């Protein structure tokens, strides 16, 4: 039911599946023509045994979006797929340190909750670097006219040298040649990261992603905190209509907090663009 | 919808938040509700509470509301998990349901597989399994009589309590079809052919699902269509593919399964018929 | 001893390895034994198997051996876990015993406490009478044990198993000893009688003290003894005469029974025969 | 009772117990005198509610042994202890990657998983551990319970020998005398200890051999398929584990040297370090 795409097709016999991280770790022999005989560790996304029709179409769409998005340092990259005779396997780059939320919580400074890595406590500069890298990834994404729609710390992967990689393009959409994407009435986007236009007007643009980026920044500087703490989603709707905004994370410069607030401007066009975010973050990073 | 939306007040079902103490997670958490039974106003009763998570989407809230509404109009029955109330006003939505002491059927069954099969628990007798099937048929028969389609019938969605009592659960995808129901969110391996190929869902679609449930029961929690990816199932069902008979399952019960998997909905038995047959098979067992 | 050592043959208790199929751990694992009951040769019966682990020590082996031997020597009784057989020849030592489908008493009691900590079974909520019945059944088990001149030394709710029919069965004879003709520290401190340490002696009266602690666990529905008090401080406290408070909703009559059990002087504590008699009356009146 | 030792005593109010890893994670403010108000994550060892007299005597012994071993990069170090007015707390260094056995089983090749050990990484692990033992032996201390499960891995793949509950000081004595039926896992026990109840640094060398086998099998279980009760006889008959797949004959021969029936004929930890350093370099 899925026509072949020779450019990305990967031979199943060259793929050995491992334990799940549904995404499972795996070994792909020569998924990089450069090193024909070299086996490399990769992550494989597949369907669960109880998958729905929508899960299959979501995995396909996700695979195709990654093809069109292109390659960037701060984006988890697609390496191939097994789409013929057999279960659909979307093969992507493996990120050894998991998602950013867990990554940060694990290396929070002592004083003030699972595995811990003190030799990696986050310095303020590390946090700013994380934010700058992510702004760079989004800037590239937007330049490719793609909206992510599900940007959050849980959807950012961290690889070897604390390199941030945007991931999880299951809800991403291409808005080339259209002014904005039209969300369904009751979408599948986590509400706490949703821009107001999306939530109330069902409209989605790059500036909507900028809003999400603001919540992500708050996650970063709270070292993995959960947005709008103590506020259930059902009560958030009203609060947002009344302009509610999260306060400054402890141990965060007023400058960075103001950046978050700019990201949460009620007027989309009045929020910075990812291009401006990168420019400002680069400066802030440079200083520090 | 969900965002600029506000849950109305429903007296007979509302339950005070100060009277509910959320417990440990079973999103569903265990909990204690004082007076949920208006006949024992001082009695703290243990119950299960379904609520939204922090990362909830608009559709999650929409589904929880729908689930709650479906349960209100389904009425009591011993083989169906029933609604005890809800905290809808001023605060997060809490759907209070009855607590099942033994967990979901799928795991309940895998726990008691024979040593060397595929914390352990005492094996199940054939009579026990037949009984489980019977009760489930009785639960669905009542559900169909209330003109409700469950659509997500599976072992993972049946709760076990007391003395091997079966209680149909999770009405998150259930629909009221009084006065059929036109990318599905239903697990493919439990889906009737017409559900996709024709975008239609009736009680006869639920009967197909019941068949798969029976297979799960007699394979002691096995995964349907083992080794076959969901993406290939489409074709196979079309060619007439059907699951093999579970080991140690009477031919009589397996034929019941096959009847349930008739391509044409009108050629599958009705839950009334299944209840009658199963009632006899249980007696003879 | 364990290393350069070989287990003697005992045809009476020996069970064929080829007729035992090991299951998953409950090390004790569930298993199916065909013909363990020589009267139903073709019947496969669910049993529990105690065996050594990969990282077992020499002491683990000798302890397993003595545990098995103690059970052979104690003899049958309704309130004591039953030894069904053993695979001692040519291969790992497997001590086969009766399977108790409801688990250990501590967890059993905790799962059915009344409202107001894992799985709950409200439909089997403990009534005052059930607790008395449990204490009684256990009194009878220990009375029988004493009559066989065997001290348990490790009596505790975690070492009591409850069958599907809610029958109390004394278990874990890993530390049990035969004192036929006292026994001059691997015993959990909070269940230990004063003379056990301070005097290095152990008699049936030591087991009676433990029984008292067990009673307390029963009536607090699986509570932890001396809550908030570390084992290292217990020593001193018992010396000053410290004793646990009465469990909530426990009759004073039963609490006095507990205190009698905790008499500093062993000879001043009741005997299991006396406990059985008293408990038999209290049960009937309840 | 337990007389105070000001040198190691740490105030209880400065320690905040955390989730368990019995051993729990914790935060100790100023556990480093050089870092006054600086809080640091550590691991606290304590007794369980059902502890025996022996459990307590062992925890005390564990602490005292650590108080005399001294510090070394490849040994989990003692930081302090709360011994007065309250439960006994042995405060030790926190290892961020858990124990070596699981650390390795998770690093196994496909066919929660983790990347993967290169042969060089395994050799480095082995070398670091030989270094830790060499220091231990130089301190005239026998570990007696050396195994992958008792090695902790921290931050940057640094091996730290841990669990000194069975460790003993043999300064001024030719060998330690084991109890008849000891509490030492048999599969890691040198024959002299098992059959003759004698224990020397060379007995630890034997255990090191089994440890090597664990490392190169990426966390495999020694004498696979052989129950402890059958191992006794096999060892009397000179049984020895075969070469782990994907292991150089050179490293396997090192293991075999470690399992020489004659203690003095086994390499010393000093020789092991020397040889491993060379092998590591050529790798
Ligand atoms: N490519 C990838 N590399 C590493 N971890 C990944 C991954 N994709 C998903 N995961 C993790 O596995 C599981 C997800 O919740 C996420 O934490
Ligand atoms: N009402 C209920 N009672 C008990 N367990 C429930 C429940 N609803 C959901 N669960 C559990 O939560 C999860 C399911 O797999 C099941 O085990
Ligand atoms: N014959 C039997 N039938 C059923 N369950 C049994 C059993 N023998 C033991 N068990 C259960 O299996 C559990 C695990 O066995 P094991 O003997 O290893 O524990 P243990 O007694 O050493 C631990 P503790 O007493 O500290 O909880 C026991 O705690 C008990 O609950
Ligand atoms: N200091 C320490 N740091 C981290 N983990 C430890 C530790 N001491 C013990 N552990 C681990 O916790 C559990 C043990 O089996 C061991 O793996």
Positions of CATH 3.30.200.20 in chain D: 1-94
- Cβ separation of B184 and A234 shorter than 8 Å? no
Q: How many CA atoms lie within 13 A of A207 on its CB side?
A: 15
Ligand 2 neighbourhood includes B196 CB (under 6 angstroms): no
> CA of A179, closest CA in chain B: separation in Å?
23
Considering only CA atoms, give the Rg of chain B: 20
**Active site positions of D, annotated:** 145
Q: Whose CA is nearest to atom 22 of ligand 3?
A: C27
CA-B25 nearest atom, ligand 2: 12
> CA of C5, closest CA in chain D: separation in Å?
9
Distance CA B139, CA B144 (A): 9
Instruction: Give the residue among B196, B80, B205 at the shortest CA–CA distance from B151.
Output: B205
Assigned architecture for domain A1-94 = 2-Layer Sandwich (3.30)
CA atoms B50, B52, B54, B60: torsion sign: positive
Ligand positioned closest to the Cα atom of B24: 2
> CA of B20, closest CA in chain C: separation in Å?
12
Q: Whose CA is nearest to atom 1 of ligand 2?
A: B99
Distance CA C30, CA C82 (A): 15
Q: Which residues on adjacent β-strands are paired with residue A80?
A: A91
Distance CA A277, CA A263 (A): 9
Ligand 1 neighbourhood includes A23 CB (under 6 angstroms): yes
- Cβ separation of C4 and D195 shorter than 8 Å? yes
CA distances, B156 to each of B110, B213, D173, D207, D271 (Å): 11, 9, 65, 48, 59
* B41 neighbors B62 (Cβ within 8 angstroms): no
Please name the fold of domain A95-286: Transferase(Phosphotransferase); domain 1 (1.10.510)
Name the closest residue on chain D to residue A107, using Cα atoms.
Answer: D96
> CA of B75, closest CA in chain C: separation in Å?
22
Positions of CATH 1.10.510.10 in chain D: 95-281
3-state DSSP call for residue C62? helix
Q: Which residues on adjacent β-strands are paired with residue C248?
A: none
Distance CA B118, CA B125 (A): 18
Q: Whose CA is nearest to atom 4 of ligand 4?
A: D95
Q: Binding site residues of D, as ranges?
A: 21-23, 45, 93-95, 99
Q: Which of A87, A154, A200 sits opposite B231 (nearest CB)?
A: A87
> CA of C47, closest CA in chain B: separation in Å?
10
User: Helix axis angle, C272-285 relative to C204-219, nearest 10°?
Assistant: 30
Ligand positioned closest to the Cα atom of C30: 3
Helix (H) / strand (E) containing C94: strand C94-98
Report yes or no: B46 at the C interface, CB cutoff 8 Å.
yes
Distance CA D66, CA D91 (A): 11
Name the closest residue on chain A to residue B62, using Cα atoms.
Answer: A186
Q: Which of D49, D52, D222 sits opposite C187 (nearest CB)?
A: D52
**Active site positions of B, annotated:** 152
Q: Which residues on adjacent β-strands are paired with residue B149?
A: B175
Neighbours of chain D (3+ CB pairs under 8 A): A, C
Catalytic: A150? yes
* C230 neighbors C241 (Cβ within 8 angstroms): no
The dihedrals phi and psi of A212, each to the nearest 5 degrees, come to -60, -40
Residue with tokens 């278990």: C171
Q: What was the structure determination method?
A: X-ray
C98 is in an annotated binding site: yes
- Cβ separation of B56 and A233 shorter than 8 Å? yes
Token pair recorded at residue C171:
């278990």
Ligand 3 neighbourhood includes C104 CB (under 6 angstroms): yes
Residues followed by a gap in chain C, C→N > 2.5 Å: 26, 116, 181, 184
What's the distance, CA A263 to chain centroid?
Answer: 17
Distance CA B231, CA D240 (A): 51
- Cβ separation of B119 and C46 shorter than 8 Å? no
Resolution (A): 2.2
A/D touch flag: 3 or more CB pairs below 8 Å: yes
Distance CA C94, CA B142 (A): 51
* A68 neighbors A15 (Cβ within 8 angstroms): no
The neighbour count for residue C208, using CB atoms within 10 Å, is 24
Q: What are the pocket residues of ligand 4 if the criterion is a CB atom closer than 6 Å to any ligand atom?
A: D 21, 23, 43, 76, 92-95, 98-99, 152, 162
Q: What HEC string does chain D produce?
A: CCCCCCCCECCHHHEEEEEECCEEEEEEECCCCCCCCCEEEEEEECCCCCCCHHHHHHHHHHHHHHHHHCCCCCECCEEEEECCCCCCEEEEECCCCCEHHHHHHCCCCCCCCCCCCCHHHHHHHHHHHHHHHHHHHHCCEECCCCCHHHEEEECCCEEEECCCCCCEECCCCCCEECCCCCCCEHHHCCHHHHHHCEECHHHHHHHHHHHHHHHHCCCCCCCCCCCHHHHHHHHHCCCCCCCCCCCCHHHHHHHHHHCCCCHHHCCCHHHHHHHHHHHHHCC
Token pair recorded at residue B238:
């079309």
Rounded to 5 degrees, what angle do the CA atoms D183, D186, D187 make? 145
C100-284 maps to which CATH number? Answer: 1.10.510.10
Strands, sheet with B28-34, edge to edge from the N-terminal-most edge strand? B20-25, B28-34, B44-50, B94-98, B83-87
Quote the ligand 3 centre to C15 CA distance (angstroms). 22
Q: Whose CA is nearest to atom 9 of ligand 2?
A: B28
Ligand 2 neighbourhood includes B157 CB (under 6 angstroms): no
The dihedrals phi and psi of B245, each to the nearest 5 degrees, come to -75, 135
Distance CA A274, CA A146 (A): 13
Classify residue C274 by burial, with Cβ atoms within 10 Å: 0-12, 13-18, 19+: middle
D/B touch flag: 3 or more CB pairs below 8 Å: no
Report yes or no: C240 at the B interface, CB cutoff 8 Å.
no
Which residues from A are below 8 Å from B199, CB to CB? none
Positions of CATH 1.10.510.10 in chain A: 95-286
Report yes or no: C201 at the D interface, CB cutoff 8 Å.
no
Report yes or no: C29 at the D interface, CB cutoff 8 Å.
no
Report yes or no: D219 at the C interface, CB cutoff 8 Å.
no
Q: Binding site residues of A for ATP, as ranges?
A: 21-23, 45, 93-95, 99
Which residues from C are below 8 Å from D187, CB to CB? 54-55
Q: Which of B54, B185, B187 sits opposite A192 (nearest CB)?
A: B54
Ligand positioned closest to the Cα atom of C50: 3
Q: How many CA atoms lie within 13 A of C239 on its CB side?
A: 8
3-state DSSP call for residue C249? coil
The neighbour count for residue B119, using CB atoms within 10 Å, is 8
Classify residue A112 by burial, with Cβ atoms within 10 Å: 0-12, 13-18, 19+: exposed
Report yes or no: A22 at the D interface, CB cutoff 8 Å.
no
- Cβ separation of D96 and A115 shorter than 8 Å? yes
Please name the fold of domain D95-281: Transferase(Phosphotransferase); domain 1 (1.10.510)
* A278 neighbors A131 (Cβ within 8 angstroms): no
Which residues from B are below 8 Å from C21, CB to CB? 115-116
Q: Whose CA is nearest to atom 18 of ligand 3?
A: C27
Q: How many CA atoms lie within 13 A of D194 on its CB side?
A: 24
Q: Which of D25, D29, D113 sits opposite A116 (nearest CB)?
A: D25
Out of C37, C54, C90, C154, pick the active-site residue.
C154
Report yes or no: A25 at the D interface, CB cutoff 8 Å.
yes
Token pair recorded at residue D82:
């709360």
Q: What HEC string does chain B produce?
A: CCCCCCCCCCHHHECCHHHEEEEEECCEEEEEEECCCCCCCCCEEEEEEECCCCCCEHHHHHHHHHHHHHHHCCCCCCCECCEEEEECCCCCCEEEEECCCCCEHHHHHHHCCCCCCCCCCCCCCHHHHHHHHHHHHHHHHHHHHCCEECCCCCHHHEEEECCCEEEECCCCCCEECCCCCCCCCCEHHHCCHHHHHCCCCCHHHHHHHHHHHHHHHHCCCCCCCCCCCHHHHHHHHHCCCCCCCCCCCCHHHHHHHHHHCCCCHHHCCCHHHHHHHHHHHHHHC
Report yes or no: D195 at the C interface, CB cutoff 8 Å.
yes
Token pair recorded at residue D69:
């071993």
Q: Which residues contact A238 (CB under 8 A, 6 or more apart)?
A: none
3-state DSSP call for residue C275? helix
Assigned architecture for domain B1-99 = 2-Layer Sandwich (3.30)
Neighbours of chain B (3+ CB pairs under 8 A): A, C
C164 is in an annotated binding site: no
Positions of CATH 3.30.200.20 in chain B: 1-99
- Cβ separation of A56 and B186 shorter than 8 Å? no
Helix spans in chain C (H): 58-74, 105-111, 128-147, 194-198, 204-219, 231-239, 252-261, 272-285
Distance CA D126, CA D107 (A): 16
Instruction: Give the residue among D275, D283, D125, D86 at the shortest CA–CA distance from D213.
Output: D125
Q: Does the domain formed by B100-283 have CATH 3.30.300.30?
A: no
């Amino acid at each position: 039911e899925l026509p072949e795409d020779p450019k990305w097709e990967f031979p199943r016999d060259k793929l050995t599946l491992g334990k799940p991280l549904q995404v499972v770790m795996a070994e792909a022999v020569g998924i990089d023509k450069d090193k024909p005989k070299e086996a490399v560790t990769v992550a494989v996304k597949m369907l669960k045994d109880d998958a729905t029709e929508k899960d299959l179409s979501d995995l396909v769409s996700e695979m195709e979006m990654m093809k069109m998005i292109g390659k960037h340092k701060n984006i988890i990259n697609l390496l191939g797929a097994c789409t013929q005779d057999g279960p659909l396997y979307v093969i992507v780059e493996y990120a050894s340190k998991g998602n950013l939320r867990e990554y940060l919580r694990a290396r929070r400074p002592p004083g003030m909750d699972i595995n811990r890595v003190p030799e990696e406590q986050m310095t303020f500069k590390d946090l700013v670097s994380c934010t700058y890298q992510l702004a760079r990834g989004m800037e590239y994404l937007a330049s490719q006219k793609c909206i992510h729609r599900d940007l959050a710390a849980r959807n950012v992967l961290v690889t070897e040298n604390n390199v941030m990689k945007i991931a999880d393009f299951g809800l991403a959409r291409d808005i080339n040649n259209i002014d904005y994407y039209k969300n369904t009435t009751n979408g599948r986007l986590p509400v706490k990261w949703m821009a107001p236009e999306a939530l109330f007007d069902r409209v989605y643009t790059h500036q909507s992603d900028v809003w999400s980026f603001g919540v992500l920044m708050w996650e970063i500087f709270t070292l993995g905190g959960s947005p709008y703490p103590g506020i259930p989603v059902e009560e958030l709707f009203k609060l947002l209509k009344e302009g509610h905004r999260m306060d400054k994370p402890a141990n965060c410069t007023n400058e960075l907090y103001m950046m978050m607030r700019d990201c949460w401007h009620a007027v989309p066009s009045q929020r910075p663009t990812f291009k401006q975010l990168v420019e400002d973050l680069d400066r802030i990073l440079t200083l520090t």
